[PDB]
DNA sequence: TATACTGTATGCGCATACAGTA
DNA sequence: TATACTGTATGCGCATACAGTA
């Protein structure tokens, strides 16, 4: 049930038209737009999308294309797990650089820089991170958030708190994946 | 140019159909849903809305009815301009209001390490729910002599204390009998992005 | 002429089936 | 049979104009 190259276009094209002109496109509009000389090319490109279950075609209704598949989500506890947990319509282009997901922080390791137990962490899904940055790493399937400081094979993860000590790692006898870069924080306690 | 009652209905019907079926309605659909026996009634009620500039009609395009309809960041504020003194705000970040509890109304750019020990850092965008009913113990955005302050509230009638979550700061004491004091709103959460 | 419509009427607008050709 | 199409037809689905009646 995977989308082809040209089928991805059509579906991306519908999303645009609905988002741009507030209404779904006609077959002839899809053809026109993409370059087909036959509206039937759109028809079958649509019929397929309906079978691969990404759209719903309404019989008779002009512009009767309803999208189906359809804001940054939080993972909760474990860096991405299919397909938990929450769904929150936040601005991704609010952080620098753009956030991809949220992680529910756990513990007071990064206290001294305003990262508290229970915060929602804004993270960028990348692997190129540099020294001194704040990062989400996964030491043996165990997701952790700290300040990075690598030296070849010796990777040091520092906490922002004086009661916590550096977590030293050696990739030669431990698995270690960078989940992403910490770009911002969102707190939503309803505390009294 | 305000809308007539029957025209307010028609506009609400479209608003719904779009939100219920993913696409604008036809003339016949409007006539059907509202009880007209003639789609021309839908046509004119639409043409009227087009004049009143609330919708746009696309010629020839079936269902060619286009409608013509987030949180803000308060600027550090010069004295004598209110909440919300205007143009102070500095921009709008289109977040989720129903994310926080109670629903957040605006963001204030925090200033200082007074609320450090609870994760409120100099330069965080604080989310705020505008209200004047804030209980003691809660965190509030108050205004001592047009001077927006953020702290933990402890009000004892006429003597009002503003408590900071930091050990190097002292509690700010206010006496309403000789200083103005506005509860601007309730601190419902924090947002950091720089 | 301006709202609020019922009724009738054209006719492009559009969805959609039945052919090809790669 | 499944993509990707070009081409042709068949008709309703639709916007809209032209009267009427309150």
From Swiss-Prot, chain A:
<dbReference type="GO" id="GO:0006508">
    <property type="term" value="P:proteolysis"/>
</dbReference>
<dbReference type="InterPro" id="IPR039418">
    <property type="entry name" value="LexA-like"/>
</dbReference>
<keyword id="KW-0238">DNA-binding</keyword>
<dbReference type="GO" id="GO:0005829">
    <property type="term" value="C:cytosol"/>
</dbReference>
<dbReference type="GO" id="GO:0004252">
    <property type="term" value="F:serine-type endopeptidase activity"/>
</dbReference>
<dbReference type="GO" id="GO:0045892">
    <property type="term" value="P:negative regulation of DNA-templated transcription"/>
</dbReference>
<dbReference type="InterPro" id="IPR036286">
    <property type="entry name" value="LexA/Signal_pep-like_sf"/>
</dbReference>
<feature type="active site" description="For autocatalytic cleavage activity">
    <location>
        <position position="109"/>
    </location>
</feature>
<keyword id="KW-0068">Autocatalytic cleavage</keyword>
<feature type="active site" description="For autocatalytic cleavage activity">
    <location>
        <position position="146"/>
    </location>
</feature>
<keyword id="KW-0678">Repressor</keyword>
<dbReference type="InterPro" id="IPR036390">
    <property type="entry name" value="WH_DNA-bd_sf"/>
</dbReference>
<comment type="function">
    <text>Represses a number of genes involved in the response to DNA damage (SOS response), including recA and lexA. Binds to the 16 bp palindromic sequence 5'-CTGTATATATATACAG-3'. In the presence of single-stranded DNA, RecA interacts with LexA causing an autocatalytic cleavage which disrupts the DNA-binding part of LexA, leading to derepression of the SOS regulon and eventually DNA repair. Implicated in hydroxy radical-mediated cell death induced by hydroxyurea treatment.</text>
</comment>
<dbReference type="Pfam" id="PF01726">
    <property type="entry name" value="LexA_DNA_bind"/>
</dbReference>
<keyword id="KW-0235">DNA replication</keyword>
<protein>
    <recommendedName>
        <fullName>LexA repressor</fullName>
        <ecNumber>3.4.21.88</ecNumber>
    </recommendedName>
</protein>
<dbReference type="GO" id="GO:0000976">
    <property type="term" value="F:transcription cis-regulatory region binding"/>
</dbReference>
<dbReference type="Pfam" id="PF00717">
    <property type="entry name" value="Peptidase_S24"/>
</dbReference>
<dbReference type="GO" id="GO:0042802">
    <property type="term" value="F:identical protein binding"/>
</dbReference>
<dbReference type="GO" id="GO:0032993">
    <property type="term" value="C:protein-DNA complex"/>
</dbReference>
<dbReference type="GO" id="GO:0006260">
    <property type="term" value="P:DNA replication"/>
</dbReference>
<dbReference type="InterPro" id="IPR006199">
    <property type="entry name" value="LexA_DNA-bd_dom"/>
</dbReference>
<comment type="similarity">
    <text>Belongs to the peptidase S24 family.</text>
</comment>
<dbReference type="GO" id="GO:0006351">
    <property type="term" value="P:DNA-templated transcription"/>
</dbReference>
<dbReference type="GO" id="GO:0003677">
    <property type="term" value="F:DNA binding"/>
</dbReference>
<keyword id="KW-0378">Hydrolase</keyword>
<feature type="DNA-binding region" description="H-T-H motif">
    <location>
        <begin position="27"/>
        <end position="47"/>
    </location>
</feature>
<dbReference type="GO" id="GO:0006974">
    <property type="term" value="P:DNA damage response"/>
</dbReference>
<dbReference type="GO" id="GO:0001217">
    <property type="term" value="F:DNA-binding transcription repressor activity"/>
</dbReference>
<keyword id="KW-0804">Transcription</keyword>
<keyword id="KW-0227">DNA damage</keyword>
<dbReference type="InterPro" id="IPR050077">
    <property type="entry name" value="LexA_repressor"/>
</dbReference>
<dbReference type="InterPro" id="IPR036388">
    <property type="entry name" value="WH-like_DNA-bd_sf"/>
</dbReference>
<keyword id="KW-0805">Transcription regulation</keyword>
<keyword id="KW-0742">SOS response</keyword>
<dbReference type="InterPro" id="IPR006200">
    <property type="entry name" value="LexA"/>
</dbReference>
<dbReference type="GO" id="GO:0006281">
    <property type="term" value="P:DNA repair"/>
</dbReference>
<dbReference type="GO" id="GO:0043565">
    <property type="term" value="F:sequence-specific DNA binding"/>
</dbReference>
<dbReference type="GO" id="GO:0009432">
    <property type="term" value="P:SOS response"/>
</dbReference>
<keyword id="KW-0234">DNA repair</keyword>
<dbReference type="InterPro" id="IPR015927">
    <property type="entry name" value="Peptidase_S24_S26A/B/C"/>
</dbReference>
<comment type="subunit">
    <text>Homodimer.</text>
</comment>
């Amino acid at each position: 049930k995977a989308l082809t190259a040209r089928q991805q276009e059509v579906f991306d094209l519908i999303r645009d038209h609905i988002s741009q002109t507030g209404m779904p496109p006609t077959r002839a509009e899809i053809a026109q737009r993409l370059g087909f000389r036959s509206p039937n090319a759109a028809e079958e490109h649509l019929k397929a999308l309906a079978r691969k279950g990404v759209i719903e075609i309404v019989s008779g209704a002009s512009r009767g294309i309803r999208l189906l598949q359809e804001g940054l989500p939080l993972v909760g506890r474990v860096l991405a797990q299919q397909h938990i947990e929450g769904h929150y319509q936040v601005d991704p282009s609010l952080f620098k650089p753009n956030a991809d997901f949220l992680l529910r922080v756990s513990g007071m390791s990064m206290k001294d820089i305003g990262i508290m137990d229970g915060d929602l962490l804004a993270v960028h899904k990348t692997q190129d991170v540099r020294n001194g940055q704040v990062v989400v790493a996964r030491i043996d399937d165990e997701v952790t958030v700290a300040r990075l400081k690598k030296q070849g094979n010796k990777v040091e993860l520092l906490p922002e708190n004086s009661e916590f000590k550096p977590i030293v790692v050696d990739l030669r006898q431990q698995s270690f994946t960078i989940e992403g870069l910490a770009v911002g924080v969102i707190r939503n306690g309803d505390w009294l």
